[PDB]
């Protein structure tokens, strides 16, 4: 019931986030490398840094939906990234993700965000294959709702 | 617009709000003397040791209720406490103090909020008196909106 | 190679040691009790409170004493208190303390290090009594090296 | 005094100082970056990259060499990445860092140290032309004591 219509709260809560000095250099060290290469043909290198990522820090077996769910929130938190849900379709799954992080510059952020999200694409897709998922079966975005707010859609 | 109806970021939230060890060690401690001792006999010797802690951290002058209200909400992320906002009156101040710090226990939850309240009585009277403020001028709890929300009267 | 020659990086240590805000007010808290009561006649209720922490926070089982220090470590660089070594001899066993935390007030800080001696001792019993240890037992100061390292002794 | 001969304590230490997830995220973009394009030719992008991040947080005017000591230890404790002393020579200055954080892989560490060399070269050009030095003036390694410690000499 306690939500964050004070300015104070939401601004305190975001710079608690993210710490002090090393987002400032990372955020710095993305745009830099983004300016000098560009935006589509550095996509994929970037994916493949996620990737390693998962590989630092490996999942225990699941066996339900709902155990996986816990499992990543958990390690999110861990990391004091956000939250992410899981939801079921017809087909296809989709994760939605909430509390994205926020760059403090305002005028870079729109770059930065996009940036972030293709980290996530290749962190998620190895998570999957934590169960056995084939290598060739990846994630792609769909939507985006606004500047702190994703959803991801997982198909075979 | 990042609301907390996911229990998972506000589990998160309050978790971070008081790290693990102190707080606990702290709230036995407070519950301790209160069973004691009662919880009306020991509102007045806990509302001094409110004004000694107002006694390490004084803060700047202010000339405006505004810049008051930013030096308090500055000093209280520094503690990392919460937020509280300022509204005025015909002949009274009132202060609504948000997201109220909940011991993990959920039993003993109850009594700890009460406890909690008393000792920002304290606090709140000697900043008042930053502006010069008479020294038997003071505050009184009037309601209690819920678990993790308060307000405070100020009038002569 | 890194040594603490330098007053700054002590100074940072331990700030980051007790997080800003809590630590204040728990010191304030124990000083007004003790100074109230007296220093011989709260040292049994303090231990009292400690055994309480000692149930919110219970161990894995442990075969070796190697094992048991390897989780006391592990739980106390949780808490943040500091590190332990332990010591055997023919019949009883030592508990060498360091790094003890420090008030940042001068002229309170000797009386504040009795006090917390006092929590750790209820505490580490409950610890010791996790293998089984009966209710008898008891453990005991004998010497204080300076104002940041402590010794326990531990006998059947 | 509290010396870390229990690598207990150093580890912790340690732990704290770079905490999980961005350091490791940092670490591997910075790896990834040098093995694509060379250790030689990628020393003066960094740099260029430290003068970015010094643009951010500009320090106050200081009259004495002591004063700036002051001012960038504060500074580096807010970063929280060590500490730094000043020492002046007949004609040049030295400046002697120590606690140099240090990566988890313990196999890239090495290379890592390097790295981060650099980008501290840049940082430190810039709060040197707060005294009103000109942009001409370059700072360069002489010596490397271990992997967690370093010196740099300041010269025109």
Not at 19 to 36: H, K, Q, S, T, Y
Not at 66 to 89: H, K, M, P, Y
Not at 101 to 116: G, I, Y
Request: glycine letters at 8%; hydrophobic letters at 40%.
């Amino acid at each position: 019931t306690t939500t964050l219509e004070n300015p104070a709260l939401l601004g305190w809560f975001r710079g608690q986030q993210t710490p002090e000095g090393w987002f400032d250099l990372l955020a710095l060290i993305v745009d830099g490398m983004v300016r000098n290469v560009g935006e589509l043909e550095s996509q994929p290198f970037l994916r493949q840094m996620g990737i390693a990522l998962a590989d630092q820090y490996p999942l225990p077996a699941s066996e339900t939906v709902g155990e996986l769910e816990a499992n990543i929130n958990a390690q999110l938190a861990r990391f004091g990234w956000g939250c992410v849900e899981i939801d079921t379709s017809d087909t296809d799954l989709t994760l939605r993700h909430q509390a994205l992080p926020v760059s403090r510059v305002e005028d870079q952020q729109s770059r930065w965000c996009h940036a972030f999200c293709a980290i996530l694409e290749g962190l998620y897709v190895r998570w999957m294959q934590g169960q056995g998922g084939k290598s060739h079966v990846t994630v792609s975005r769909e939507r985006l709702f606004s500047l702190s707010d994703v959803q991801f859609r997982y198909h075979n």
